[PDB]
Design a protein around this motif. Structure first.
Motif, PDB file in Angstrom:
ATOM      1  N   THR F  35      14.927  17.474   9.270  1.00  0.00           N
ATOM      2  CA  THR F  35      14.161  16.738   8.273  1.00  0.00           C
ATOM      3  C   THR F  35      13.433  15.590   8.954  1.00  0.00           C
ATOM      4  N   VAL F  36      12.152  15.425   8.627  1.00  0.00           N
ATOM      5  CA  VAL F  36      11.291  14.482   9.334  1.00  0.00           C
ATOM      6  C   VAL F  36      10.534  13.562   8.385  1.00  0.00           C
ATOM      7  N   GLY F  37      10.960  13.472   7.130  1.00  0.00           N
ATOM      8  CA  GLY F  37      10.323  12.536   6.228  1.00  0.00           C
ATOM      9  C   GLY F  37      10.550  12.905   4.776  1.00  0.00           C
ATOM     10  N   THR F  38       9.898  12.132   3.908  1.00  0.00           N
ATOM     11  CA  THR F  38       9.996  12.317   2.468  1.00  0.00           C
ATOM     12  C   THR F  38       8.634  12.090   1.827  1.00  0.00           C
ATOM     13  N   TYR F  39       8.429  12.727   0.674  1.00  0.00           N
ATOM     14  CA  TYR F  39       7.170  12.650  -0.056  1.00  0.00           C
ATOM     15  C   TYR F  39       7.456  12.615  -1.547  1.00  0.00           C
ATOM     16  N   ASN F  40       6.772  11.718  -2.256  1.00  0.00           N
ATOM     17  CA  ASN F  40       6.940  11.535  -3.693  1.00  0.00           C
ATOM     18  C   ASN F  40       5.598  11.759  -4.378  1.00  0.00           C
ATOM     19  N   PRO F  41       5.426  12.797  -5.206  1.00  0.00           N
ATOM     20  CA  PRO F  41       4.145  12.959  -5.903  1.00  0.00           C
ATOM     21  C   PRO F  41       4.016  12.066  -7.125  1.00  0.00           C
ATOM     22  N   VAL F  42       5.132  11.829  -7.817  1.00  0.00           N
ATOM     23  CA  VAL F  42       5.066  11.179  -9.124  1.00  0.00           C
ATOM     24  C   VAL F  42       5.006   9.662  -9.026  1.00  0.00           C
ATOM     25  N   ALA F  43       5.309   9.086  -7.866  1.00  0.00           N
ATOM     26  CA  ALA F  43       5.104   7.656  -7.685  1.00  0.00           C
ATOM     27  C   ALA F  43       3.642   7.323  -7.928  1.00  0.00           C
ATOM     28  N   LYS F  44       3.402   6.269  -8.709  1.00  0.00           N
ATOM     29  CA  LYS F  44       2.045   5.988  -9.166  1.00  0.00           C
ATOM     30  C   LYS F  44       1.057   5.856  -8.018  1.00  0.00           C
ATOM     31  N   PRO F  45       1.328   5.092  -6.962  1.00  0.00           N
ATOM     32  CA  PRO F  45       0.667   5.368  -5.683  1.00  0.00           C
ATOM     33  C   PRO F  45       1.478   6.376  -4.890  1.00  0.00           C
ATOM     34  N   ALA F  46       0.866   7.493  -4.508  1.00  0.00           N
ATOM     35  CA  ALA F  46       1.563   8.558  -3.805  1.00  0.00           C
ATOM     36  C   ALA F  46       2.154   8.025  -2.507  1.00  0.00           C
ATOM     37  N   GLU F  47       3.392   8.429  -2.232  1.00  0.00           N
ATOM     38  CA  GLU F  47       4.207   7.811  -1.198  1.00  0.00           C
ATOM     39  C   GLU F  47       4.614   8.871  -0.186  1.00  0.00           C
ATOM     40  N   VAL F  48       4.680   8.460   1.080  1.00  0.00           N
ATOM     41  CA  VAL F  48       5.113   9.330   2.163  1.00  0.00           C
ATOM     42  C   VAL F  48       5.669   8.471   3.290  1.00  0.00           C
ATOM     43  N   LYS F  49       6.726   8.967   3.931  1.00  0.00           N
ATOM     44  CA  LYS F  49       7.309   8.330   5.105  1.00  0.00           C
ATOM     45  C   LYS F  49       7.590   9.400   6.148  1.00  0.00           C
TER      46      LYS F  49
END
Lengths: 131, 84, 164, 136, 195, 88
Positions: F35-49
């Motif tokens: 696993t190399v990160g995370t992604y959130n579509p529903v966060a009001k500003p789209a988020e990625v790490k």
RNA sequence: GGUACCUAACCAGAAAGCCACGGCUAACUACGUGCCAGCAGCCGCGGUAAUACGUAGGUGGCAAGCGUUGUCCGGAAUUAUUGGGCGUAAAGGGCUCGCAGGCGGUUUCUUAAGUCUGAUGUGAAAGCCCCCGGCUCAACCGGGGAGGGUCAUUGGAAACU
RNA sequence: AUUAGCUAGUUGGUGAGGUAACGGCUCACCAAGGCGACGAUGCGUAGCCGACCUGAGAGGGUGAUCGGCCACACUGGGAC
């Protein structure tokens, strides 16, 4: 025949103590010798001094009895019995009575008492508690 | 560089009645799980020999290899000491 | 030693037992009642009283308990250390606990400890369920308890190195 | 001493026998065999409905059913309630339940089951005895 | 129904008033005025638990869950329990003198709006975060029961501040040892649930 | 062939994905390599790490990214420095 | 899927029941019943003055749930190493000799298999635990930790087996 | 254990064939070997684990969904 000296020594001290014999004799051995030294250090006895001969000598110990004829030592327990040796990692060294008593442990760097063994991070064969 | 070292075991001969092959016993032993008392246990193997050097009673050291024969997996390294 | 009656003592009737004697004219009944009496500061002790009438039998029992009393160490409103009560097949374990647990014991044992006033303590009953023998065993243990300071003076040492 | 006796002789624990030996057995047809199962209830057809007497010297005449369950086992059962419509040859549902005062019956005839009508004229404990709320 | 009956069953008013104790303070039911036997040593702590749960108006599963949360929390299980029960926002709005009764607090916060750093809150466990100014919005700003509660002055505890002109209060750091046990002898619940 | 993958987790309506590296055959939520990160579509500003060292060695050794992870890599310029790595 | 949500207007109107009340165990009175009808987990209750059977009022517990059944763990220190016993309660073999096995007097060198302790490599993720962030607390969903080998290589110590 | 002996291509060797390989994996020849009280063989029972329930602890029960590995595809056998 006699299985291990430490059991005999502990139980003899207990037998002398419950009737309050001020004198006591034990056949001399190295381990029993420093154990007596340890109890002298911790003040569970009055004084210990030795006599030598051709048959493993003898050690004689004088038991303390407090100011008013009351038990300075109220029990002794061997836990590393022959046929079942119990060994404690350094971290799990038992705090007997959460401090009041002492547990004597043989260690890779000598035979120590509980608190100092924990203080200098050593484990090994834990042999008995003193009540 | 130097490759991985295969395990090396220590044991005693318990049979030599079969040519170019030598059976060994190893005294490896454990303590009971829920009691924690040391208890003796024996494991025996078949090891491969080239000229039947080892005899009954000898103490031998052993290293595992590829499967040379069914039930045989080990080589004879050396006879460290010979019996009476 | 005996603790005088210059104190305020409460009594908790743990049990009254029906008791009978057999005679030619049928059966002869009495009433035997034991009660644990003692202040909350730390003085405890039980008593017994047999008679034909429950209230004045309880009177007998409380007088006996007042006559026979015992002290206990109270380090931090909790026992100092481990102890097992060992009176006549009455096995009771006691352990000091943190300063929020409370009292954790059986009925008679809880009555005795709560009357003693120990705030935080846990226990266990391993012997017979007989109440009076529970009381005798636990009080034997409570007597057997030892403060730290007398232990230090007995050893010829001091509390700081005994706790160190 | 005792440690070796333990390491080799061991600690043999006791066995808690099932208190309801009929509820925990199953059956199938095209394979003729008795299965082991855990089940909280079973159904069966009453081969006899009757009434007999208990064992204690103080008595009362109780009702009972003789039922053949689905798994081909035979057993008596107790019918708790006041009155009933439980005629011979009726599909009745059984649950685990003891009746000390009556010897031999290990099971209770649950009420509100397929052909057991709820006891009439009752107010409390209505959940037991299979009766609806008396009035709307 | 439950108000008077519960209050005189326990023998303690859930809010503290002469009423519910004035002339029939003994118990509900026909056997009330007679002689009340000393509660069993199970009955005492059962009654204490009942006292706390009824006085705080909470369901049993809620109560047990909060008890486990308090136990897991550091400090002292004896009172951290009641600290959480006080942090329950219904008691907060009550102690801010925004209602006569905790029933009013429950009803209001349920359907009425109490803007405390959030559009709406029904679930009681929330708090008014210290250091922020968000207050009851401008639909119930003028309300009869609100005006009655603010005009009838009542002791706002020192860990709570409040001004009626804008009827907002900032939950301070934490509650103290006084409101902890006004009359309830805690540490009975601990072993009642240890049982 | 190994691929950079978006593995799903979360609730019945709040998807929350992890950027993971796995083979094309392993099921969507099953085994993986790392696993190399995370992604959130529903966060009001789209988020990625995203991590870009032991995650970037995968691009070095060869791993096709899915479309969304590809354009997120473009958003953070990681695929860019992966491109300059050739001429470098 | 015009679903989630926000905006208004209408109404206390549509929305509380389940079990227990002799002791264990929190809750008691009136009537009928008269070894009957029946109750039940144990003790046990009921043979005309039943707080134990069926009703009625009230109380008690819980709540969109509540009782019963069935299975597992505790209470069970009731297979007990942690944590039990064997004179009379269950329990010393009828006695002895002894293979294997289990144990081992005192001192002194040495070896490190047991032993104790570092380093490294793993013990997937998701779970339980800690700390934070987000769904209007959380149910839940995230992010970061910690724990988890009678584990493999390697180093260190030698009191004890 | 109210399941004491099981094994005779199974045990070892020399040669020859044989998935991708080492191998009684399969043959030919030679030889009496192998395994069992530390439980072989046989009978009954079961997918295994991360983990789940209880228990303060040791420990005791479970192996549903979520994840990994394994075996099966009407019942048997066969290969492309």
């Amino acid at each position: 025949v006699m299985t291990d000296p430490i059991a005999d020594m502990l139980t003899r001290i207990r037998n002398a103590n419950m009737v309050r014999h001020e004198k006591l004799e034990i056949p001399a051995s190295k381990l029993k010798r420093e154990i007596a030294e340890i109890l002298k250090r911790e003040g569970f006895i009055r004084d210990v001094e030795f006599v030598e001969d051709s048959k493993q000598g003898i050690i004689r110990v004088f038991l303390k009895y407090g100011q008013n004829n009351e038990r300075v030592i109220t029990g002794l327990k061997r836990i590393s019995k022959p046929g079942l040796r119990v060994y404690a990692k350094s971290n799990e060294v038992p705090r007997v009575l959460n401090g009041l008593g002492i547990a004597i442990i043989s260690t890779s760097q000598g035979v120590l008492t509980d608190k100092e063994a924990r203080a200098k991070q050593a484990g090994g064969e834990v042999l008995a508690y003193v009540w | 560089s130097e490759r991985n070292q295969r395990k090396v075991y220590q044991g005693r001969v318990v049979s030599d009645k079969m040519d170019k092959t030598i059976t060994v016993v190893v005294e490896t032993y454990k303590k009971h799980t829920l009691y924690g008392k040391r208890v003796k246990y024996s494991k025996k193997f078949k090891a491969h020999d080239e000229n039947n050097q080892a005899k009954i009673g000898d103490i031998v050291k052993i290293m595992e290899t590829r499967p040379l024969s069914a039930t045989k997996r080990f080589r004879l390294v050396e006879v460290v000491e010979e019996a009476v | 030693r005996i603790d005088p009656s210059k104190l305020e003592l409460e009594e908790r009737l743990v049990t009254v037992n029906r008791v009978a004697k057999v005679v030619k004219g049928g059966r002869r009944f009495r009433f035997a009642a034991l009660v644990v009496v003692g202040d909350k500061n730390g003085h405890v002790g039980f008593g017994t009283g047999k008679a034909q009438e429950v209230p004045e039998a309880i009177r007998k029992a409380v007088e006996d308990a007042k006559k026979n009393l015992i002290e206990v160490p109270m380090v931090g409103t909790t026992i100092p250390h481990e102890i097992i009560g060992r009176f006549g097949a009455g096995n009771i374990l006691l352990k000091p606990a943190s300063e929020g647990t409370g009292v954790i014991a059986g009925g008679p044992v809880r009555a005795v400890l709560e009357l003693a006033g120990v705030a935080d303590i846990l226990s266990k009953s391993l012997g017979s369920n007989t109440p009076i023998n529970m009381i005798r065993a636990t009080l034997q243990g409570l007597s057997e308890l030892k403060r730290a300071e007398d232990v230090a003076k007995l050893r010829g040492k001091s509390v700081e190195e005994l706790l160190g | 001493p005792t440690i070796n006796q333990l390491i080799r002789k061991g600690r043999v624990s006791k066995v808690e026998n099932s208190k309801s030996p009929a509820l925990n057995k199953g059956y199938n047809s095209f394979k003729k065999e008795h299965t082991n199962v855990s089940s909280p209830q079973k159904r069966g057809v009453c081969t006899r409905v009757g009434t007999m007497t208990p064992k204690k010297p103080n008595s009362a005449l109780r009702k009972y059913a003789r039922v053949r369950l689905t798994n081909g086992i035979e057993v008596t059962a107790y019918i708790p309630g006041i009155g009933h419509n439980l005629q011979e040859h009726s599909v009745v549902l059984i649950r685990g339940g003891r009746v000390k005062d009556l010897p031999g019956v290990r099971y209770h005839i649950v009420r509100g089951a397929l052909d057991t009508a709820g006891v009439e004229n009752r107010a409390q404990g209505r959940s037991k005895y299979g009766t609806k709320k008396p009035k709307a | 129904g439950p108000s008077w009956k519960l209050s005189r069953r326990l023998g303690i008013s859930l809010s503290g008033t002469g009423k519910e104790l004035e002339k029939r303070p003994y118990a509900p039911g026909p056997h009330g005025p007679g002689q009340r036997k000393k509660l069993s040593e199970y009955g005492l702590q059962l009654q204490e638990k009942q006292k706390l749960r009824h006085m705080y108006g909470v369901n049993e599963r809620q109560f047990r869950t909060l008890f486990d949360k308090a136990g897991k929390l550091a400090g002292k299980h004896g009172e951290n329990f009641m600290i959480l029960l006080d942090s329950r926002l219904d008691n907060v709005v009550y102690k801010l003198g925004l209602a006569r009764t905790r029933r009013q607090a429950r009803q209001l916060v349920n359907h009425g709006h109490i803007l405390v750093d959030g559009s709406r809150v029904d679930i009681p466990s929330y708090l008014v975060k210290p250091g922020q100014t968000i207050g009851v919005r401008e639909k119930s700003r003028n309300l009869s029961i609100i005006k009655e509660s603010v005009e009838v002055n009542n002791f706002v505890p020192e860990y709570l501040t409040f001004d009626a002109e804008k009827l907002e209060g900032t939950f301070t750091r934490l509650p103290e040892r006084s409101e902890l046990a006004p009359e309830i002898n805690e540490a009975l619940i601990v072993e009642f649930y240890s049982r | 062939a190994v691929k950079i993958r978006l593995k799903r987790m979360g609730a019945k309506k709040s998807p929350f994905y992890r950027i993971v590296v796995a083979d094309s055959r392993s099921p969507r939520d099953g085994r993986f390599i790392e696993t190399v990160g995370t992604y959130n579509p529903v966060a009001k500003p789209a988020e990625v790490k995203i991590d870009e060292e032991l995650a970037l060695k995968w691009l070095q050794t060869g791993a096709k990214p899915s479309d969304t992870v590809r354009n997120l890599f473009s958003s953070q310029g990681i695929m860019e420095k992966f491109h300059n790595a050739k001429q470098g």
